[PDB]
């Protein structure tokens, strides 16, 4: 700043800035739902949260990170875990459940404390969760196993899947409520000019 | 399998096998806490599960992927963000957090279909999460940025953190109740025998 250098001889915000004027607009990091449908698509692994019933009554979340795929068509996003708590903290044959899929990049260093920060693209979808049986089931882990292991063929590469490989697997169905996406992912940190630059160590 | 050779030419369970007697005989792929405690450790990445209440009324969790740092003597994990809902679904000043950390190998390619898998070692974390202020917050800060950020030194790389910085930050502790660990890290699926073994492009 202006300010400092002359002090050491002896605001930014509404200043001129570039902008290109076709990044999105949208507050808080937000994206458009184009962007988390290309993000669900393209990724593989997700982190799923339901709820549970404590010890002292109480439902918490459990976090399980495990391989999905998106159906769009469907509206669904399809995995299979055999992870449970003791009694699920839900009303019903589907339960809640919360799916986050992320792009995780780079830490950015910064000469200002607060700037840093870590490169991410991340989306919570919000919908419910069904377990899923027969050709329901074997359909969606078809799907599942062929989008993660790109070329591999259900029946051909692997030998089909048994009625005894469906009673062994609880394979789920999340059908979407909502979504929501947010991304940071600057190429540097925002920095202080008002101290000393990074060393090359960081930014080289 | 012999049976299924024989009738070409026309249990597992039970029969020999090598074992590592040093090998953890854990179920269901559990950890020990000293490993817990490595993996938390060297991880710098999580994500943590809280409660929210929705527009039904009903709680529902938010993961949110963030840094953090395991401080072992203190019993807690701190991190910071700014993510909120409308109304924790929880009384008091604190509240009940879930976090997650994983390393994410390999997918493992198997001509057996439901012994497709990924590589994973993966610990929820569960503990009451607080808002820190004050000195607190700074030094949680502090140790946070120089973990992820290894050689960097608050107050010398960086401007010092602060009073305004911390108003605009929420930075919280995570005070550790229990934990579960579990690792799945095979160097190759189990196959199929019976079934033509994967191609070259698969393995090799």
Same mark, same amino acid.
Request: no cysteine; hydrophobic share 50%; aromatic share 0%.
């Given at each position: 700043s202006y300010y400092h250098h002359h002090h050491h001889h002896l605001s930014d915000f509404y200043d001129p800035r570039e902008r290109d004027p076709s990044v999105s607009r949208r507050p808080q990091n937000r994206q458009s739902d184009e962007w988390i449908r290309e993000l669900l698509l393209r990724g593989t692994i997700a982190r799923v949260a339901t709820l549970w019933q404590g010890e002292d009554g109480a439902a918490f979340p459990f976090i399980t990170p495990l391989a999905y795929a998106y159906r769009p068509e469907q509206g669904d996003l399809v995995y299979h875990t055999n992870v449970v708590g003791r009694?699920? /903290?839900? /009303?019903?044959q589907g339960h809640p459940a919360t799916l986050e899929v992320s792009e995780i990049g780079q830490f950015l260093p910064s000469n200002s404390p607060l700037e840093l920060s870590v490169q991410y693209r991340s989306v919570m979808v919000f919908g419910t969760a069904r377990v899923l049986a027969g050709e329901d089931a074997r359909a969606a882990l078809t799907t599942l196993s062929e989008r993660v292991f790109p070329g591999l063929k259900v029946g051909e590469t692997t030998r089909p899947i048994s009625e005894d490989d469906l009673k062994r697997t609880s394979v789920y169905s999340l059908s979407i409520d909502r979504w929501s996406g947010k991304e940071n992912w600057a190429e540097q940190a925002i920095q202080e000019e008002d101290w000393p630059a990074l060393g090359p160590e960081w930014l080289g």
């Open positions: 009694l699920r /903290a839900n /009303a019903g």
